[PDB]
Symmetry: C2
Amino acid sequence: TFDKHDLSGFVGKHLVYTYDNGWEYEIYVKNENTLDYRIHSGLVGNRWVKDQQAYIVRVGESIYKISWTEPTGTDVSLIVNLGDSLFHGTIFFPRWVMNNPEKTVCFQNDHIPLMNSYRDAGPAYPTEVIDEFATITFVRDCGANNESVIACAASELPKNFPDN
Amino acid sequence: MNTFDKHDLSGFVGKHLVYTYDNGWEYEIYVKNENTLDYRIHSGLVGNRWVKDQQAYIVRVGESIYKISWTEPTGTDVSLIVNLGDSLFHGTIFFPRWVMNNPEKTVCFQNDHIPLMNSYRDAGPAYPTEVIDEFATITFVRDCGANNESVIACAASELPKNFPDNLK
């Protein structure tokens, strides 16, 4: 009843959400195969990333899936159910990230060699699976390829974010 | 509140599915209970591999749509979507590099060989990770109840040639 590869209902979406473990995240679906994201709190609070290549598909009339692999070794797969305002994430963290998560807290784009070095040193295993629903607290449409959406770490945002 | 209980898995526990990814690889899963699956691979990169009692994270993300994710003794990560209402299936598999290089090393009844899988995982190379992200066509679905040890109990190569027509 719908086209699986029509992502026009999802590209441009800018979401802020809080996982049931209390961690607050933000994503911006920048185009059909790219996102920016910004972490506000939790294990890796203040980490942020631009231009992450991702696999984005439509799995229901208003439900989308977005998955990717990171320079740290982390794998991620998210479900965004816009029709029901439901969000679910699975994050597969390498063991070294669980052991010292602050190592990943940076603007990653300026530190890809560092992340790769940490990844390759490990320990990679055992993988830690974080699997949680989240509450979507903000959603807007910011179009494709909008570099103004995520342009600083969360700590540099106005205190009333996203009320602005 | 949500119009369904996202924590209620009763519509998915017990499900037995056979499906073929868009690249022709045929797989089979059995949702054994709220945090466990058995699975059986028929063809593709790792055809004939099968696994019982894989711990998994199983959730409901829509009225008739479920998600199942897990990590393996080989280092592989998996996350699947089963949309029963629309008969839609989507899988993402994150394979370690060593699995791409020598997939046959994983082709076994894994439960007989878990330490070996861990040894291969640890030897690596783990990276770069290979992502397989594909829709599949569901070709068979039935309900088998929870904790049914007869659903997946041999390698695919040992199934009758008319499988799953021999079942229901």
